[PDB]
Amino acid sequence: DGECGGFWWKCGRGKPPCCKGYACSKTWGWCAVEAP
C-alpha cells in the first residue's frame, strides 16, 4: 500500500511517494506524470 500524491503536488527530490506513473522534480518543486 505505497502512498501516492496527485497530478501536480509539491515535492523536493522525491520525498513524498507520488502515484505510479508520476515523477517528482527538485528543479520544478512538484510531482506530476512524466509525459515528456
17, 1 Cβ separation under 8 angstroms:
no
Q: What is the largest CA-CA distance in the chain?
A: 28
The experimental method, as deposited, was NMR
25, 1 Cβ separation under 8 angstroms:
no
**Cα(1)–Cα(13) distance, integer angstroms:** 21
What does the H/E/C string look like for the chain? CCCCCCCCEECCCCCCCCCCCEEEECCCCEEEECCC
**Cα(32)–Cα(19) distance, integer angstroms:** 9
Question: Based on the number of CB atoms within 10 Å of its own CB, is 31 exposed (0-12), middle (13-18) or buried (19 or more)?
Answer: buried
14, 24 Cβ separation under 8 angstroms:
yes
Q: Which three cell numbers stand for residue 33?
A: 506524470
DSSP state of 16: S
**Cα(29)–Cα(10) distance, integer angstroms:** 6
